[PDB]
């Protein structure tokens, strides 16, 4: 009884404090600067050989090698410079949802509808690849397990729970709770101390690895959240939702700054990404296209076309030289 | 270049292995099994598996029972299966609207607009006993039952009451009304009557898959 009244009073106080510190807007300050114009990109390489749709991808740390995962139970490693296959690993379970690449290039991980994110070893004396460890402590399906170091990994599953693992012993150490719907994505800070997540209850949270407590919460959307990415500076991020919108949040103010919305667009967004200098924004849509937005002006500039089915992954190299996309027709392309 | 020609050799070998793998992959049919509790789904047969073979043809069947009750996110994976098997219990009148609602929700999806459905009406023996003895009515739950007549296409079993036939065909028409209302000609529905001790259940799936493939092929030559 009194709990709901106290919650309402606290929410009113928080909203008053948050709205009491807004003087101007971002669009009112960057009016004087000139726009970027028009940018056109042409595909350079096309990679073929997969049997079914592609669900995930990841770039290497040297921006030459990349890995891909397919629904037929395969995990191939490519050489983007010369389009040469280096490895081909068969999976025990056909349903796979994610993949990762270690920073040092010695391990590869994957997981899916089997509630397990496995670890593979790439440099062995016998000359082949083999499973090094298996982790099983989750209930629902697994949507993202992302490396943090050579000895620890961060995983988010579909039972509204995130955890921090220990590869050496296989036992989890820290558990994060607080969401209501299942978690769909996460991103890591450049210093590897903080990370964010987006669930299916239209909210996002900022966690602390060392302690294990929530810091602050941002809510400005209206539907489920499908993707999230971090600003190169380390003090902002962008999210993609199911109502065809993107928003930019500021950590130091706990308010949204701009909305990237346009008419005659009625499809959701599956993935977002930034650039090396943080001046452009790329987003993949369900209408078989890809758009490039202007971060400081929120107006479209350039389109990427050529796919014949919905896109499902998107990434940018560490040195900022190429973009790679994968779709549901099992073709990978590199733009420049 | 002596160390870069061997890389091309290795890549060609890997590609030739994938070529062998494709032929094995392409010659197998997958099936998805759905339903609810108290339906005898397990009697007919976070991931299960079951492989059976008929006339030197391989079939794969999956069952999902390790997740929560929210199925609007992991159901997009099964968008390229051959067919979907739906199991209902046609002997309890208190839980028919739920089955109808899930059937409608599955049928009217956007990523599953080219997938056919094979429908099993399980537990056909308890319904006859319930109607013959007599302790509950049907017009109390469905008011439309008071103006139903058996269609001329009926094929009653030898030596059975016509009331049971009317009850069976009303329940079948309830699903057929939804099935034949939003079809553009890309997928259909195959009704069936199933008992708890029947022995011929793989042949029905065999024939239904054959019919699905034949219709799909005939459609695109402007012959259908």
């Amino acid at each position, epitope marked *: 009884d009194q709990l709901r009244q106290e919650a309402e009073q606290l929410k009113n106080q928080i909203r008053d404090a948050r709205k009491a510190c807004a003087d101007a807007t971002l669009s009112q300050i960057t009016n004087n600067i000139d726009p970027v114009g028009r940018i056109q990109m042409r595909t350079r390489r096309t990679l073929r050989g997969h049997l079914a749709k592609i669900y995930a991808m990841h770039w290497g740390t040297d921006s030459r090698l990349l890995v891909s995962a397919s629904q037929d139970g395969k995990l191939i490693i490519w050489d983007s410079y010369t389009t040469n296959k280096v490895h081909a690993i068969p999976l025990r379970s056909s349903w796979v949802m994610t993949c990762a690449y270690a920073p040092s290039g010695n391990y590869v991980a994957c997981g899916g509808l089997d509630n397990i994110c496995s670890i593979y070893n790439l440099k062995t004396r016998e000359g082949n690849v083999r499973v090094s460890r298996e982790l099983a402590g989750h209930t629902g399906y697994l949507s993202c397990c992302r490396f943090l170091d050579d000895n620890q990994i961060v995983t988010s599953s579909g039972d509204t729970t995130c955890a921090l693992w220990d590869i050496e012993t296989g036992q989890q150490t820290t558990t994060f709770t607080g969401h209501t719907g299942d978690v769909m994505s996460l991103s890591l800070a450049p210093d590897t101390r903080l990370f964010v997540s987006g669930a299916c209850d239209a909210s996002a949270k900022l966690w602390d690895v060392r302690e294990g407590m929530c810091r602050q919460t941002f809510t400005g959307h*209206e539907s489920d959240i499908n993707a999230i990415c971090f600003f190169p500076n380390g003090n902002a991020f962008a999210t993609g939702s199911d109502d065809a919108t993107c928003r930019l949040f500021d950590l130091r103010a706990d308010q949204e700054l701009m909305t990237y919305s346009h008419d005659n667009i009625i499809c959701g967004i599956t993935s977002v990404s930034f650039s090396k200098s943080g001046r452009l924004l790329l987003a993949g849509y369900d209408d078989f296209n890809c758009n490039v937005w202007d971060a400081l002006k929120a107006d479209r500039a350039g389109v990427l076309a050529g796919h014949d089915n919905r896109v499902s992954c998107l990434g940018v190299t560490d040195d900022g030289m190429a973009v790679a996309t994968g779709s549901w027709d099992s073709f990978l392309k590199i733009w420049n | 270049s002596a160390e870069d020609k061997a890389a091309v050799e290795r890549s060609k070998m890997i590609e030739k292995q994938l070529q062998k793998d494709k032929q094995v992959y392409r010659a197998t049919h997958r099936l998805l099994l759905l339903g609810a509790d108290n339906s005898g789904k397990s009697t007919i047969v976070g991931i299960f598996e079951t492989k059976f073979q008929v006339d030197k043809v391989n079939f794969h069947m999956f069952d999902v029972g390790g997740q929560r*009750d*929210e199925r*609007r996110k992991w159901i997009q994976c099964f968008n390229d299966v051959t067919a979907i098997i739906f199991v209902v219990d046609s002997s309890d009148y208190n839980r028919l*609207q*739920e089955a109808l*609602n899930d059937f*409608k929700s599955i049928w009217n999806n*956007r990523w599953l607009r080219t997938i056919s459905v094979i429908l099993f009406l399980n537990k056909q023996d308890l319904l006859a006993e319930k109607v013959l003895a007599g302790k509950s009515k049907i017009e109390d739950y469905f*008011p439309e039952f008071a103006r139903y007549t058996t269609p001329e296409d009926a094929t009653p079993e030898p030596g059975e009451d016509p009331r049971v036939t009317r009850a069976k065909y009303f329940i079948r028409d309830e699903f057929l009304r939804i099935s034949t209302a939003s079809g553009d000609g890309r997928h259909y529905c195959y009704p069936h009557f199933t008992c708890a001790v029947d022995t011929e259940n793989a042949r029905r799936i065999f024939n239904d898959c054959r019919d699905i493939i034949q219709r799909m092929h005939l459609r695109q030559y402007e012959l259908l």
Partner: nanobody
Amino acid sequence: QVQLQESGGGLVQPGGSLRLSCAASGFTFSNYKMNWVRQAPGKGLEWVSDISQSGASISYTGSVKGRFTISRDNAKNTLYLQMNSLKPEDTAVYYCARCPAPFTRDCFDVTSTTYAYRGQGTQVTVSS
């Protein structure tokens, strides 16, 4: 933030009429589908009614036909339910739910307390 409210409950004798309201805020009310869901005292949640975006796609359940009416007012973001000639078996709690995504023809609302877009509920007593 998605927020919904309920009002219009009370204690009534067998035979009468009363109304309900579902005030909506925080989103575009004209691009979504609306439902009414009721759970019995001890049973699970049960579907009751429905209404679409345009205004004419009304549907009901078998046990309430001829006694319940559902309408919406797009100019004020309000959902209504007019019910009369009640029976002693209707002593449950009602909710006001919405489908997840816009411009859709399907939604999955009946879930064991794990659905985020739903109201708080109101109490209705008809036996006494």
